[PDB]
Amino acid sequence: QVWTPLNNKFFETFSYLPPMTDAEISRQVDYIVSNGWTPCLEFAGAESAYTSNENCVRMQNTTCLYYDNRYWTMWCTDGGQVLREVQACRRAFPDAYIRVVGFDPVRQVQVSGFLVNRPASVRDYQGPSTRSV
Amino acid sequence: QVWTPLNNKFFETFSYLPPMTDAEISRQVDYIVSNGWTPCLEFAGAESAYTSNENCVRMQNTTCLYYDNRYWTMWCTDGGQVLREVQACRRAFPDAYIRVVGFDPVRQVQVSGFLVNRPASVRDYQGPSTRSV
Amino acid sequence: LTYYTPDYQPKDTDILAAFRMTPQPGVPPEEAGAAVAARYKGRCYDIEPVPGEENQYIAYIAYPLDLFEEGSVTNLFTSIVGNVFGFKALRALRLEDLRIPPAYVKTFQGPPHGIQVERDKLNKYGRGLLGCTIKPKLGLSAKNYGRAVYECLRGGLDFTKDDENVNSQPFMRWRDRFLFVAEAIYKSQAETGEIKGHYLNATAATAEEMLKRAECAKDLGVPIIMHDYLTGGFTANTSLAHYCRDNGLLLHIHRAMHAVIDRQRNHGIHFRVLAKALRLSGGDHLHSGTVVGKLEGEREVTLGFVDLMRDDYIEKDRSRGIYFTQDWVSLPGTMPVASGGIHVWHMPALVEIFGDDACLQFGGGTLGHPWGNAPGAAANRVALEACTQARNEGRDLAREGGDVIRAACKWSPELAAACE
Amino acid sequence: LTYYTPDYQPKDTDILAAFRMTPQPGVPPEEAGAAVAARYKGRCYDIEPVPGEENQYIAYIAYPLDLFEEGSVTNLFTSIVGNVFGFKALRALRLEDLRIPPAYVKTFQGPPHGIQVERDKLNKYGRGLLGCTIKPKLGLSAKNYGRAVYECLRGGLDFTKDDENVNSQPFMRWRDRFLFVAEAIYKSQAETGEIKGHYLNATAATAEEMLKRAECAKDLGVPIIMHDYLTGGFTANTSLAHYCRDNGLLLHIHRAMHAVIDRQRNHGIHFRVLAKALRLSGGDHLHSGTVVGKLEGEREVTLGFVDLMRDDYIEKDRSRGIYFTQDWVSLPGTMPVASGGIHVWHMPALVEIFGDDACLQFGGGTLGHPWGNAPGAAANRVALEACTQARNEGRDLAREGGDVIRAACKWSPELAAACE
């Protein structure tokens, strides 16, 4: 079989697994909470979801390690609350990818980041069986 | 609530207030005239209304403080005349944002600049209640 | 006394200083002024007693223009206040004002752009500028710092700034912060369509390192950097201001360690002299006051040094602390930045006091808005714009600020959660 | 013995070494420790016999901080192990550990970015990184090398790397390879939407040539380069690490020629000392182990040097080979890279042993997947993500790795052809 290079976009962690269900998202959020970390939600439409070099035109010397759309837009006690917020974000922005992020409150660093929602309207991604043709 | 990052463009001064009525525009123009300044009208279509880096590709060394579309196109005794010119510009260019500018005649510098018209056809901006979702 | 000449008429090129001095008992004021004064000799030409304070006099000293190095704030401060605060004959000594003759002013470059060039470059007119200090102060990673910057700027804020003590630390190296802040600035610009900026701290150990950080900011295309002039030094500041003029960068100036010199009324150098030294050395913005509760300090004194750092021609006004008429001969003005706890209902007062040519800074980091950083920034922007619109209509802000805030809140959901 | 002081208490600034030495018969251990030790004199303050080996002792040496040049791994190695392995009085000698006092650590820049800055720059969290070594080792043209890089990266791999002996040869000059690899990296980035990279080998004959190759990588905008520090030298490595910090480049470190010094148990320098020297000199990644069949070497020893090269504070643990408490005073950590034959069903074991802060390298070049390079990369990525998800759910990987692999294979056609 051949890995398809057409409409096969991916979003880093857990993006190569089948779309996670509510129970799986809940278990991941519980894992984040268990470690002592804070979960939050990021979202972006299809125009600002993938990495790009749009602003590299303004730079000189080098553009090493600079990529656009690394930041998404921010949307935290347990899995159920984060799941409710996931549904709320889905209703508010149906054409936007949702990403669950984790933040270590002591080190003040991001420790987690996995996609939990892919807009049905957008078709820039494949499915577990359509990834190979 | 969450500040919407979708179709929420803004145009500097007074852009975060609800759309100004004819009386409010008139009062602002009267304020400009009272100070001894000259009011004029700027307009631009949606393709040249927002700041952009289109011409930065032609530059080297640096692009600091350079942005495209800072200049709009020019379209002056009292509020009523400027209001009449605002209606004339609206009729002539219905799909164009209109901006009232002020110029100090002694210092020869721009002293004022507020948007007074948002084309109904264009939907790149939100409303006072739709700015948060 | 060869150095006390009450009949002397100061020349148009003399540098004049007004010293508030309290001599030791038994020392006549004329003798103390003669000592401070002591062809190239400084001379005391005028002494006036302070009405209200015992044994307190204002001594006016005239220095010849040939005494100082052209375009050197360092030399000016070395000559005027080098070793005069250590005189045993003076119980206390306080430099209150300086008169910089146009001949000297013309030897300085001044601020890189000034207020009007800043407004033209940023395309923002008719309103004050808004800024936030990213909080927490320290410990945040460059990624999280950039995330906070983007969240605050997308709300409607014109600027964000690094904390005064954030230069380059194990927790957040400076180049990582510069890159992430550049990405955040560009994202917020694309989202809102307004030109955004972040005061990147270039303050460093060596002038070479400071110029390297300025060079990185220039290579990223970002608009503005920051410097601590009272801790970095006038020599470092002047180098940075010349660089910023050469490369088209804005320069925000933070007055760290200022209270160590301008707090006590009897000893030190009044902030107005430090503000004039900054305007000579160069700076587009200068943190000029704190708003704890309300704008602190005598209003007239604040207005005096704001006018001294803004206008081109300030006439002598002892009520506001102007001891000398200051002609700036078209030197670019410096924008005052009022920082601290700028609460939403306190915006009308500061808009009335400062006007449009100032930057209001939310150095508290906001975060008081229950919804988030972005809606809090929007609420602030909505409040500032509503106050400006009311002032332009002829309203008296000091009397109708609450009414204007309420009326703006009636239609702004973001301000509704902020006004509570 | 003036150099054996068993009552000496090491200072907070002393550099401490733990030597495992076997003296010649007739030589008492105290005399041998005194010799190794021999105001600026190194002294033996502690000697413990090895329980389990005949005539084997651990000698603890304390060196004053004034003995070494600030920020110089070269000098440190010259002072500690310059000429001590050639002593006739010692049958065998092995440096086991070093204690770098914070005072010395602060004089080093350390790794250019570290683990957390790497994760933030690459925007990859919660999982280990994946890499492949382009195979065949040599003979491939720059075009074909780039084609292989693109095929492996588009599958889902985060990194690819040049072979250790691929620097610049008649068959493939370095600049052609850099250009074709840059095109491949950018194509794979555009196709998958994830940030990709390739460890470009900058190892060269002269420091000037190495810096030129780093400069080319910087001019292409590619993320990461590679260096052979034990063959290129600490002086060359430190220059490259300073350059990478200055220009925002990641630095992968390969330990070529390491077994010539860290293989024999009785003679040489233990890899943990080389890992600490690398972390001081600078490196974001450090090839730290081989997985032939399974992770080779005592697990505790591996865990010890992985913690030593990762954590900020490692307490003394003789079970894992930590002879001294190591405080890193906020020096950036180095990411360990486990390479070799990482088969799909062996992923759960390595994920359990290393966790998320490691890079698993398929130095075998994969190619075992009947479909191609890209599906093989996808299978590996699917397996790693499934193992990580299972571990996050509370599963015991060492007991359910096969079940997790099978369950992932049930829905992954690419992994189905790999699991067979």
**Ordered DSSP codes for B57-109:** GG--S--TT--BT-S-EE---SHHHHHHHHHHHHHH-TTEEEEEEEEETTTTE
CB D352 within 8 A of CB D404: no
DSSP A18: P
Bridge partner residues of D339 (DSSP): D290
What is the CB-side half-sphere exposure of residue D141 using CA atoms within 13 A?
Answer: 3
Cα distance from A117 to chain B (closest Cα, Å)? 18
Contact between chains at C184 and A71 (C-beta distance less than 8 A): yes
Chain A contacts to D (CB-CB under 8 A) = 1-3, 5, 8-18, 24, 27-28, 31, 49-51, 56, 61-67, 70, 101-102, 107, 109-114, 124, 128-129, 131-132
CB C196 within 8 A of CB C153: yes
Main-chain dihedrals φ then ψ at residue C190, nearest 5 degrees: -65, -40
> Given D123, D375, D393, which is nearest A3 (Cβ)?
D375
Which chains have 3+ CB pairs within 8 A of B? A, C
Smallest CA–CA distance from B57 into chain A, residue: A57
d(CA A41, CA A74) in angstroms, rounded, equals 6
* Other Cβ atoms within 10 Å of C378 Cβ, number: 29
Q: If we measure between CA atoms, which residue out of D273, D259, D266, D278 comes closest to residue D322?
A: D273
Contact between chains at C192 and B8 (C-beta distance less than 8 A): yes
* Other Cβ atoms within 10 Å of D25 Cβ, number: 7
d(CA D366, CA C258) in angstroms, rounded, equals 64
Contact between chains at A73 and B133 (C-beta distance less than 8 A): no
> Given A111, A129, A132, which is nearest D375 (Cβ)?
A132
CB C90 within 8 A of CB C22: yes
How many residues appear in chain B? Answer: 133
CA separation, residue D64 to residues D14, D79, D100, D327 (Å): 5, 11, 11, 18
Main-chain dihedrals φ then ψ at residue D227, nearest 5 degrees: -150, 145
Contact between chains at D386 and A9 (C-beta distance less than 8 A): no
DSSP state letters, C346-403: GHHHHHHHH-SSSEEEETT----SSS-HHHHHHHHHHHHHHHHHHHHTT--HHHHHHH
> Which residues have CB under 8 Å from C410's CB, separation 6+?
none
d(CA A91, CA A107) in angstroms, rounded, equals 33
Bridge partner residues of C61 (DSSP): C17, C44
D254 is catalytic: yes
Find the helix packing angle between D207-220 and D234-247, rounded to 10°: 20
CB B20 within 8 A of CB B116: yes
Cα distance from C142 to chain A (closest Cα, Å)? 9
One of D113, D198, D252, D254 is an active-site residue; which one?
A: D254
DSSP A19: P
CB B114 within 8 A of CB B14: yes
3-state secondary structure of C7: coil
**Experimental technique behind these coordinates:** cryo-EM
D353 touching chain C per CB within 8 A: no
CB B14 within 8 A of CB B20: yes
CB A105 within 8 A of CB A36: yes
CB D263 within 8 A of CB D270: no
Residues of C in contact with B46 (CB under 8 A): none
To one decimal place, what's the resolution in Å?
Answer: 2.4
Q: If we measure between CA atoms, which residue out of A30, D112, B118 comes closest to residue C193?
A: B118
D241 touching chain C per CB within 8 A: no
> Which residues have CB under 8 Å from D217's CB, separation 6+?
A64, D178, D200, D202, D225, D249
CB C192 within 8 A of CB B10: yes
* Other Cβ atoms within 10 Å of D393 Cβ, number: 13
> Which residues have CB under 8 Å from B80's CB, separation 6+?
B26
Contact between chains at C375 and B110 (C-beta distance less than 8 A): no
d(CA D392, CA D394) in angstroms, rounded, equals 6
CB C189 within 8 A of CB C222: no
Cα distance from D121 to chain C (closest Cα, Å)? 8
Which residue type, as a one-letter code, is found at position C102? P
d(CA D331, CA D284) in angstroms, rounded, equals 12
CB B105 within 8 A of CB B119: no
3-state secondary structure of A90: helix
Chain B contacts to A (CB-CB under 8 A) = 2, 5-6, 53, 56-57, 60-63, 133
Contact between chains at C378 and B17 (C-beta distance less than 8 A): no
C313: Cα separation from own chain's centroid: 18
Alpha helix locations (H) across C82-195?
Answer: 102-105, 115-122, 142-154, 174-192
Contact between chains at D392 and A13 (C-beta distance less than 8 A): no
One of D121, D135, D212, D218 is an active-site residue; which one?
A: D135
Contact between chains at B10 and C124 (C-beta distance less than 8 A): no
d(CA C152, CA C134) in angstroms, rounded, equals 8
Query: Any known ligand binding at D410?
Result: no
Q: What is the dihedral of CA B70, B73, B76, B81, to 10 degrees?
A: -110
Contact between chains at A92 and B133 (C-beta distance less than 8 A): yes
d(CA D112, CA D332) in angstroms, rounded, equals 8
In the B/C pair of chains, how many CB contacts fall below 8 A? Answer: 128
Q: If we measure between CA atoms, which residue out of C271, C273, C276 comes closest to residue C289?
A: C271
One of C196, C254, C270, C346 is an active-site residue; which one?
A: C254
CB D128 within 8 A of CB D358: yes
> Which residues have CB under 8 Å from B74's CB, separation 6+?
B40, B41, B42
d(CA A61, CA A63) in angstroms, rounded, equals 7
Which residue type, as a one-letter code, is found at position C227? H
Query: Any known ligand binding at D287?
Result: yes
Smallest CA–CA distance from C169 into chain D, residue: D330
d(CA C91, CA D128) in angstroms, rounded, equals 69
Alpha helix locations (H) across C88-141?
Answer: 102-105, 115-122
Residues of B in contact with A73 (CB under 8 A): 2, 5
3-state SS track over chain D: CCCECCCCCCCCCCEEEEEEEEECCCCCHHHHHHHHHCCCCCEEEEEEECCCCCCCEEEEEEECHHHCCCCCHHHHHHHHHCCCCCCCCEEEEEEEEEECCHHHHCCCCCCCCCHHHHHHHHCCCCCCEEEEECCCCCCCCHHHHHHHHHHHHHCCCCEEECCCCCCCECCECHHHHHHHHHHHHHHHHHHHCCCCEEEEECCCCCHHHHHHHHHHHHHHCCCEEEEEHHHHCHHHHHHHHHHHHHHCCEEEEECCCCHHHHCCCCCEECHHHHHHHHHHHCCCEEEEEECCCCCCCCHHHHHHHHHHHHCCEECCECCCCECCCEECCCCCCCEEEEECCCCHHHHHHHHHHHCCCCEEEECCCCCCCCCCHHHHHHHHHHHHHHHHHHHHCCCCHHHHHHHHHHHHHCCCHHHHHHHC
Smallest CA–CA distance from C126 into chain B, residue: B112
* Test the B interface: residue of A52, A56, A58, A86 with most B CBs within 10 Å: A58
CB D140 within 8 A of CB D151: no
d(CA C59, CA C48) in angstroms, rounded, equals 7
- Tokens for D305, please give them: 């040097």
D135 is catalytic: yes
